[PDB]
Each structure stands twice: as C-alpha cells, then as structure tokens.
Write a protein that binds this ligand. Structure first.
Ligand SMILES: [Mg+2]
Ligand SMILES: [Mg+2]
Ligand SMILES: [Mg+2]
Ligand SMILES: [Mg+2]
Ligand SMILES: [Mg+2]
Lengths: 51, 55, 88, 100, 117
RNA sequence: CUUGAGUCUCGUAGAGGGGGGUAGAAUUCCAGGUGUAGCGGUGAAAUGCGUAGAGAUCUGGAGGAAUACCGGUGGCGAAGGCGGCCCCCUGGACGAAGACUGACGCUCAGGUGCGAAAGCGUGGGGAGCAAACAGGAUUAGAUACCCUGGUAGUCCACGCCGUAAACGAUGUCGACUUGGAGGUUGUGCCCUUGAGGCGUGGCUUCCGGAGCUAACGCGUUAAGUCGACCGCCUGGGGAGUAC
C-alpha cells in the first residue's frame, strides 16, 4: 500500500491500510493456521450473514 | 474478463493494492468472475499486471 | 474419450449399417477401443485411480452387453468376440 | 494439430535477436504443415515487476495452430536460449486473429 | 556528518515493542531508537506513547545529519504503528511518502500454534 | 414396442485424477554494507540472542513448504478428498434437435478395489510448524496449560497399514405429495433493442404446509406416501474385552 500525496498537508490517509491489508490479514495469521476450524467457524458466519 | 492481454479491462477489476476486487462489490456474475480471475492471474505472471504494490 | 473419427470408423465396421450407434456389437467394439487404448495410459502413472474407476465401468458394462448379446442371439455373440479377440 | 496462444518475452539487450527468433520458430511450424494465425511484435515494454532484474521486456505473440509435437519442441528451445525469459502457451479455443 | 537532507524512516510496530530506524534512501542506517530502550519496559513499553518518545528520540540522533524530508516505511500491527509517524512529522520532518511494508505471504509458511488459554 | 438403461452428435461448467514444468509473496539460513545497545518474550518474568556487534535496515545468494486476493450460502468427486498459472495424458456429470440399440434393468452375501490423519519399511528431502526431549516460568505441587529451543514427523518416490465423531451420526434404485425466498450451471422465447423479463432441465442453500415423530425436529434433496434388494439392532456393566 503506497501513499505519496503532493502538497504538504500531513494527512495520514490510513484508509488504504485499513481497507484490506494490515490488521485483519496479520491478526488472522498471528496464531496457528486453522485446518478444520476454517471450513466451519468461518462458514458459520453465513449462518449469521443470512439473517 | 475473458482475455488477459486486455490489461485495460482487468485494471478495473483490481483494487489499488493489486488484488482482484470481490464479486459482490463489482456485481459481476460468478461465471464471469471465475473467467476473470484466471485471466488476471496469468496476466500477472506475464508481468502485464502487478501482484501487490511493492512488486 | 475417443476421437470422433475413430468412432464413426468403428460404427461402420460393426454397425448394422450406418448412422446407427445403438447396435450391441457396436457398443461392445467401441468400448474395447478405449479399454485397450487406456491400457497404455494406465500402464504409466498407475496411481491414477479416479480414471481407473471409469475404465472398470466400461469393462463391467461391456461384460453385460456381450452377455446380453449371447442371450438374444448366440450367433452375433460368437462372431463379435472373434473380431475383437476376447473371452480369453 | 491443435492451436496455441504462445507468447514469449526476450531480454531487452537482445532485441536484435527477436526478429531472427520469430523467423526460425515460424519456419519450424509451417515446415510441418504449421499455420500461424497471429504474429504480433509488441517489442520492448515496461514490466509490472522486475522479473529477475530489468523492468523492460520484449513480448511477442503467436497464436499458431500446429501439432503438439513441434510446439513442444519449441517450448524446450525457450529454456535453452538465455536470451528468452518468461514464456506462456495456452491451447486452441478456436484460432484467434487480430486485435490484442 | 554527511548531510543527507532526506532519507527514510522504518517502524517495527511489533505487538510487544516498537523501534524506529532512520536511514538514507539507500538503506544504510543513520540512527535508530526503540520503545524498550526509551525507558519503560514490558507492560509499559508496548503502548502507543512508547513509540512516540522513541521516534522523537531517533531524530535527536540523526537530525544531526541535516535531514529535511523523509519517507515512512511502516510494517506490523500493534501500537506505535501510527503514533511513531505523527511524532516524526511533528518534529519538523518534511514527510513525503507513507507506505506499508508489513509482510503478507500469499499462503506460505505455517504459523505457530502458540497461545492456548 | 419404447417410456427404463445404454450408444452416437454437438455443446457446458468444474479445486475430478495421474505426470511434468513454472511464478510471486513470505519465513529461515549464509555472505557483505550501514548502524549501536539493546532485542526477544510474558500477565509479569526468566531461559535465549547481543559489544566475538544483535535487533533494525540494505544488497546478493541458498532452500523447503504452501499457494493472499478471486472465494461463495460456490464447484467437482463413490467415498476418503480436491484451490496459484501453463502443458501433456485421462474419468465422470448435465442440456439439447435429434439419431441409434431394444428391458441389455434395480439390488447385491462372499469377492475385488478405492481408504483422512497418525503410524511402519527402503531411499531422498528438510524452510516453517512440532509428539519426544531440554531449559525458563506459574503452582502447594505442575512429569500441563505459557515462554525458549527441538528430534521423529509433516514434504517426495515406492511398498504396507486399513482405522476416524470415515457424520446428513440418515444404504442404494425408482414413483407419487401444498408453497416461499435464494445460489450454480445448461437451454428455449421474448423491439433481447435492456441491466434484461418470461419459461424449462441438472445440481444446491434456508423457511415451511399436510403428514410423520416420544420430543427435538424432518418436511418434494423427507425422517411424508409406496415398491425392490441389502446391511444392522434385541437392557447396562463386564467388552468391541478373552479365546
Ligand atoms: Mg512449544
Ligand atoms: Mg500419512
Ligand atoms: Mg516414512
Ligand atoms: Mg455432488
Ligand atoms: Mg424445514
């Protein structure tokens, strides 16, 4: 995620990092993998997404 | 979406990070999404597109 | 599966005449083609079990077509085996 | 006899070979009843990423319809030609011609 | 001592500690600082404030190089991820480019089990 | 005889299988530059790594494993299971204009084959993770949970093992029985001038009616209503143990 904004106005623009990469992708890989836990615990979200 | 050399089209189906955009966001059909993914993937391999931002 | 050409080709040598592909003799012959042609594909690789599953289905099936033919008319049966050299 | 959309990119400082390469590859194909249906020379081009140094390659199209035998022979040469780098090749999908 | 006027600032935003290393656009480190060394430890060195006193401390070590502008290379979660940058710029540093270099494998090595309570 | 079953023609989607290449991200390790006193870890710690210069950062190199995003209520498979891209070899499924065969079908004791992970043999490979093991910690104790390491193994080839909550805890085949919302794929009609709308086959989610059920629930993908064949149960423990 590259950010180079012309005209100095010190505005972080942390939207990119917090739009996909950064946390969420790291916290997801922090501990062990998943194996069987993903095919469920993750798909157990659709049981919620439905309603 | 059907061809890979058509980088001009695939760029629309890719975020700013380089990863292809989800199907729900774009709205595009699933059948088409799959066909797109393949074109995009092989396109990146021919250095016609980026993998991420760094390289 | 089998080439469209090699197919029509065999449909004539055993087919009741032409344009017909239901003839017992035809099927049996057609199967033997892949059955034999596949032996090469299986002679190599071997661990390709999933593909074998299809192979056996052809054999076991041909076994029925042949067995059936024998019941409906021993003649065609005996002759059929000769050209394809089957039944041990 | 099948179709393939072969596309190979050669090292930039080898651009002068690009043409020579094409003639040989093409000849080999047609030589055995080949049948080229698209020959595009994109020449030098910036790379998305520095694929093993240098960010500029020399892409070329082919989309030639010929028996797997020759196209296979050709695939190997690409490996024994330090000049050429990446190389991809897909199947028929009905001869393509023009555009790109 | 060499006068660079513009280099880059790396930030190791680790869930436990945060260290900032100022170096020219080449990679050659000019100076660094770390929350752990900036005083507080453990329960106190892993806070957003930690990186602040650290980053600002990294400047009072390299600013002596005549630096004017400098890009930012942020990698890793935890605090001091953003805190470090602010203090850096707030120090007069003419910021320019802020890019996240956090490592993200397209499914490679197997992460450690760890933590189980 | 043609409606069951099958063959042919042409299309369609797919992480179906076997073989061989190959790409990018990342980890680790080795070498060198910059640089300097911490890093690492936890609830704190400590073990450990650091002035023999770590960590950080940059450059080059070595190697193994897995393929972010796409990705899904998704797809394929007999089941086990199968995700980067490319080629080669190869199996099945579905639709439809039809053409052909003519009951060639369904089920299946024994039999034969396929079988996750772990494990076993021979020879390779070995980055990350990690039984064993060794330290540090916590505790009354801690042969654990946590931290620092780390062997088998995990990876490959070939042979063996044949088990699992091998689970939908629901055998296979076929026919009937209100509806709703959605997914995926084939196909037909419609100014298709459209995103499109309407039909109509395959596979698939959730909801629910009758009915069924001890209840929970199932509910046209039934656990409803029926027919064909098979497997299995007959109180708990002892015991899936002994012989
Ligand atoms: Mg451990
Ligand atoms: Mg095993
Ligand atoms: Mg072994
Ligand atoms: Mg299925
Ligand atoms: Mg229901």
């Amino acid at each position: 995620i590259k950010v180079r904004e012309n005209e100095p106005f010190d505005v972080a623009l942390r939207r990119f990092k917090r739009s996909c990469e950064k946390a969420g992708v790291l916290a997801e890989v922090r501990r062990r993998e998943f194996y069987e836990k993903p095919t469920t615990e993750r798909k157990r979200a659709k049981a919620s997404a439905v309603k | 979406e059907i061809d890979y050399k058509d980088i001009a089209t695939l760029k629309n189906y890719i975020t700013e990070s380089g990863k292809i955009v989800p199907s729900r966001i774009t709205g595009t059909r699933a059948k088409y999404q799959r066909q797109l993914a393949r074109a995009i993937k092989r396109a990146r391999y021919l250095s016609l597109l980026p993998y991420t931002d760094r390289h | 599966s089998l080439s469209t050409e090699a197919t029509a080709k065999i449909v004539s040598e055993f087919g009741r005449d032409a344009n017909d592909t239901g003839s017992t003799e035809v099927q049996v012959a057609l199967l033997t083609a892949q059955i034999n042609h596949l032996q090469g594909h299986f002679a190599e690789h071997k661990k390709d079990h999933h593909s074998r599953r299809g192979l056996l289905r052809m054999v076991s099936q041909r076994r029925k077509l042949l067995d059936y033919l024998k019941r409906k008319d021993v003649a065609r049966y005996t002759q059929l085996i000769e050209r394809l050299g089957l039944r041990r | 006899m099948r179709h393939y959309e072969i596309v190979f990119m050669v090292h930039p400082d080898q651009s002068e070979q690009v043409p020579g390469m094409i003639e040989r590859y093409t000849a080999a194909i047609t030589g055995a009843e080949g049948k080229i249906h698209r020959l595009e020379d994109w020449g030098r081009r910036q790379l998305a990423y520095p694929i093993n140094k240098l960010h500029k390659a020399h892409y070329v199209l082919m989309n030639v319809e010929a028996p797997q035998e020759v196209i296979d022979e050709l695939e190997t040469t690409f490996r024994f030609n330090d000049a050429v780098i990446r190389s991809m090749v897909m199947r028929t999908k009905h001869a393509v011609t023009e555009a790109s | 001592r060499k006068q660079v006027s513009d280099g880059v600032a790396h930030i190791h935003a680790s869930f436990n500690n945060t260290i900032v290393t100022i170096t020219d656009r080449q990679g050659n480190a000019l100076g660094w600082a770390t929350a752990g060394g900036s005083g507080f430890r453990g329960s106190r060195k892993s806070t957003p404030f930690a990186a602040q006193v650290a980053a600002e401390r990294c400047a009072d070590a390299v600013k002596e190089y005549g630096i004017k502008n400098l890009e930012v290379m942020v990698k890793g979660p935890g605090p001091g991820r953003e805190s470090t940058i602010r203090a850096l710029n707030a120090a007069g540093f003419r910021i320019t480019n802020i890019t996240d270099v956090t490592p993200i494998p397209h499914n490679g090595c197997r992460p450690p089990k760890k933590r189980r309570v």
